[PDB]
Ligand binder design. Structure first.
Ligand SMILES: O=C(/C=C(\O)c1nn[nH]n1)c1c[nH]c2ccc(Cl)cc12
Ligand SMILES: [Mg+2]
Ligand SMILES: [Mg+2]
Lengths: 150, 152
């Protein structure tokens, strides 16, 4: 769908919180282990994401971190519209699961879970699952946004 | 020079350490306050960066964090080449961004509680900023434009 629409949600592993962001139009993802599942940490993650890509709308569940006033402020400052309401919504579920999968496969290649999370994100966005000539998630997002500039 | 070259360096504000990364060919930047100017923190930042954009070469000075083994390993895993320490197309690029970033931070400090948040606001403003505030491309649009064309 729209190039400025993102979906955010939290998953968990080893008793830690993993904040996930997905660019629905491309499948590109960004994720990070955060100290706690709060609005403060969620707001910080979003500001970084927004300063990186054209984040126009973020879809999430009614998680207290996502409905907190601090995240509301961050979205306002960044000009981001919040929404709490084709295979969508389950996309975030699939991505969360897919991420935990890749993390599982590379978990022993790194000391801390946080490092493993970043390696998994790298693998996911760099992965060329389509035949030669196809685009990875990383290439798709830059392609989608570039074409939307002109 | 190429769409895969980045320069990295640390700057300091309020007694804190800000790790800065600049995509030379576009002026696009990413920054973040880190608890300590160590290799572990630097490697983590690089891994995150590498998974988002095409990072093939990283240019830095010889700060202990940048020459560390942990950074060397992250780079090895990521397929990133390293260079420590003239060329008009790179001369003082990171230096200029450290000031530009600091200036923007000074302007939006109040809008934020901690320094960490201010930095991310500064980065947001820098990447979206247009010369004279009218038309042309911002750093954010230049990087995606440069990368997009290279893909073809
Ligand atoms: O099923 C999910 C997530 C997972 O199954 C999941 N598994 N591992 N990490 N996440 C969901 C993600 N967003 C939602 C909104 C409403 C409802 Cl009822 C469910 C979900
Ligand atoms: Mg949830
Ligand atoms: Mg230095």
């Amino acid at each position: 769908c729209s190039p400025g629409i993102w979906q955010l949600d939290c998953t968990h592993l080893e008793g830690k919180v993993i904040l996930v962001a997905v660019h629905v139009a491309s499948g590109y993802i960004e994720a990070e282990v955060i100290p706690a599942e709060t609005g403060q940490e969620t707001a910080y993650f979003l500001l970084k994401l927004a300063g990186r890509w054209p984040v126009k709308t973020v879809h999430t569940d009614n998680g207290s971190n996502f409905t907190s006033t601090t995240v509301k402020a961050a979205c306002e400052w960044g000009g981001i519209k919040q929404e709490f309401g084709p295979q969508s919504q389950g996309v975030i579920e699939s991505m969360n699961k897919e991420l935990k999968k890749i993390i599982g496969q590379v978990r022993d290649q790194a000391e801390h879970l946080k490092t493993a999370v970043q390696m998994a994100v790298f693998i996911h966005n760099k992965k060329r699952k389509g035949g030669i000539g196809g685009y990875s998630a990383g290439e798709r997002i830059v392609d989608i946004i570039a074409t939307d500039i002109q």
